[PDB]
Design a protein around this ligand. Structure first.
Ligand SMILES: NC(=O)C1=CN([C@@H]2O[C@H](COP(=O)(O)OP(=O)(O)OC[C@H]3O[C@@H](n4cnc5c(N)ncnc54)[C@H](O)[C@@H]3O)[C@@H](O)[C@H]2O)C=CC1
Length: 285
């Protein structure tokens, strides 16, 4: 109702299609369920059939009061276990406090991190600080919002030293029927994305990145085509003459099936084709 998502509108649609599902021939699974009772069940994990590579994770979240109290816990059965709590200032509207803590199984290593930021209807900025044992690091992320213009800046300051450890920048541009999302990884990595939707049922997306220092440029094109039902067919391609295809269609009333396939014409004929399966969605009534 107040202070809409600006950081998420930096390039979610672009990165969503740009991040080609890693087709390792395995099966992914993800189900999220939230209710107005403070109880939130979040399950995320993957399983490899071709090879013995299956790992599942369980995350417990809580949702109390619309925009009041939120808790996020991430515990892995095989991986590391950790939890986090988020509280929204009642009197100090806009003040958001999130405290997370990581813990290793049968290790004793405990990591504490505190995140404090403020969200304004005009702009949303937040500062996070991760406390480590070998060297604590700070992660700051500030997003600016403008009528039609969007901006986002996120970088981490190197506590162990007197300088920044990592710098990330991203620009968001919203237009009538045009959407442009740019993003650069530090002063050494710079890239951009351009999404154009056609009048008809044809969506177009573009994403490319360039590594400063060398003349190596990488670009990719991905489009989406809706058939009619709950099944949509998407296509993608890499500058390396790579043929990509992703089919997203819902199966059951709560879970969606996502298919991905990558064919590298570089040796796809004298080699093989890549396939990736993964189901993601939310469990509701
Ligand atoms: N159209 C395409 O994208 C195609 C891709 N491919 C293959 O995909 C492979 C690359 O897969 P990736 O490693 O995933 O490229 P990738 O590693 O660049 O995917 C991650 C990218 O997401 C960006 N990003 C933006 N916001 C993010 C966020 N909030 N969280 C995480 N990441 C965020 C990161 O800057 C990063 O560049 C290429 O080798 C190419 O052969 C294949 C065919 C076409």
């Amino acid at each position: 109702m107040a202070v809409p998502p600006t950081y998420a509108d930096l390039g979610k649609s672009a990165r969503d299609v740009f991040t080609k599902g890693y087709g390792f021939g395995l099966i992914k699974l993800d189900l999220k369920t939230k209710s107005e009772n403070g109880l939130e069940f979040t399950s995320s994990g993957s399983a490899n059939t071709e090879t013995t590579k299956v790992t599942g994770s369980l995350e417990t979240k809580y949702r109390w009061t619309e925009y009041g109290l939120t808790f996020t816990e991430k515990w892995n059965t095989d991986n590391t276990l950790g939890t986090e709590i988020t509280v929204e200032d009642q009197l100090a509207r806009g003040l958001k406090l999130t405290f997370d803590s990581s813990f290793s199984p049968n290790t004793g290593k405990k990591n504490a991190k505190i995140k404090t930021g403020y969200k304004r209807e005009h702009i949303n900025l937040g500062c996070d600080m991760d406390f480590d044992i070998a060297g604590p690091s700070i992660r700051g992320a500030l997003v600016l919002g403008y009528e039609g213009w969007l901006a986002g800046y996120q970088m981490n300051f190197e506590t162990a030293k007197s300088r920044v450890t990592q710098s990330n920048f991203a620009v968001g541009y919203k237009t009538d029927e045009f959407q442009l999302h740019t993003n650069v990884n530090d002063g050494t990595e710079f890239g951009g994305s351009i999404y154009q939707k056609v009048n008809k049922k044809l969506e177009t997306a573009v994403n490319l990145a360039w590594t400063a220092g060398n003349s190596n440029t990488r670009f990719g094109i991905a489009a989406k085509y809706q058939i009619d039902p709950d099944a949509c067919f998407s296509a993608k391609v890499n500058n390396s003459s790579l043929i990509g295809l992703g089919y997203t269609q819902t199966l059951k009333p709560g879970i969606k099936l996502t298919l991905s396939a990558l064919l590298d014409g570089k040796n796809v004929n004298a080699g093989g084709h890549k396939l990736g399966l993964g189901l993601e969605f939310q469990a509701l009534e």
